[PDB]
Design a protein around this ligand. Structure first.
Ligand SMILES: [Ca+2]
Ligand code: NA
Length: 269
């Protein structure tokens, strides 16, 4: 039996699926620790920029979990992504320890724009800026990618980079009541929020696990973007981003929540 995680329901993804919108034909790059092969995932391809570790698969689990929130397959097992037909690409920019360099992340963003990705999910960040990172976000954006990135885990009232850059779409995390999660960074530059507490998804070893993080919020919006792209395949990154913000459920306090809670039903009418 397939379980629908509470966050997938809360963002109303199944309403999109019932309109025939599942992310089919939309290329989504997951810039993370890798993506493990898993019965409940379809990984179309990818690249690695982490020296000395295998170019495929995920020795941490983070990237596999994130991938499943975007695109766990719609079937009779496991979980269900926001965009279960999305074409997933595993772009390994963090090593098994879960950290990477500005270099590798930039190399991943270059790869994404050069390979025609429509959406790049970056469940990663740091509080401090980097011109190399900034230039890489701008690059992916220029080449047509919608860059979606986590606000960060510190709980404080500035958001992390690359999320904080204008051309990245910054995502914070809500809890099961839609209140800001205690670890969810907030402040100037936040675009939107999504579920990020007790988020069950795919994990290496053919299993499933629940995680807390802004890294778990992010893929809800990356998947919503894929839904909107399928419905409107000529729209730009910016048009998709703006539509997602405009159709979000306002939660007030934009310093905490940006434009509010991502709403896949409202985004795909
Ligand atoms: Ca499934
Ligand atoms: Na931003």
């Amino acid at each position: 039996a397939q379980s629908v995680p509470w966050g997938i329901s809360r963002v109303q993804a199944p309403a999109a699926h019932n309109r025939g919108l599942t992310g089919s034909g939309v290329k989504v790059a997951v810039l993370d620790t890798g993506i493990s092969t898993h019965p409940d995932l379809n990984i179309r391809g990818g690249a690695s920029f982490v020296p000395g570790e295998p170019s495929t698969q995920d020795g941490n689990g983070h990237g596999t979990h994130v991938a499943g929130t975007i695109a766990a397959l719609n079937n009779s097992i496991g979980v269900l992504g926001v965009a279960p037909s999305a074409e997933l690409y595993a772009v390994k920019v963090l090593g098994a320890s879960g950290s990477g360099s500005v270099s590798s992340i930039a190399q991943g963003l270059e790869w994404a724009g050069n390979n025609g990705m429509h959406v790049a999910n970056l469940s990663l960040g740091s509080p401090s800026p980097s011109a190399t990172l900034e230039q890489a976000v701008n690059s992916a954006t220029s080449r047509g990618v919608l860059v979606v990135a986590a606000s960060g885990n510190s709980g404080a009232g500035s958001i992390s980079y690359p999320a904080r850059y204008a051309n990245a779409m910054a995502v914070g995390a809500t809890d099961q009541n839609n209140n800001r999660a205690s670890f969810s960074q907030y402040g100037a530059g936040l675009d939107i929020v999504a579920p990020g507490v007790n988020v069950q998804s795919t994990y290496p070893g053919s299993t499933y696990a629940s995680l807390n993080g802004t890294s778990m919020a992010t893929p809800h919006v990356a998947g919503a973007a894929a839904l909107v792209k399928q419905k409107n395949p000529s729209w730009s990154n910016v048009q998709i981003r703006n539509h997602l913000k405009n159709t979000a459920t306002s939660l007030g306090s934009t310093n905490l929540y940006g434009s509010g809670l991502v709403n896949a039903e409202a985004a795909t009418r």
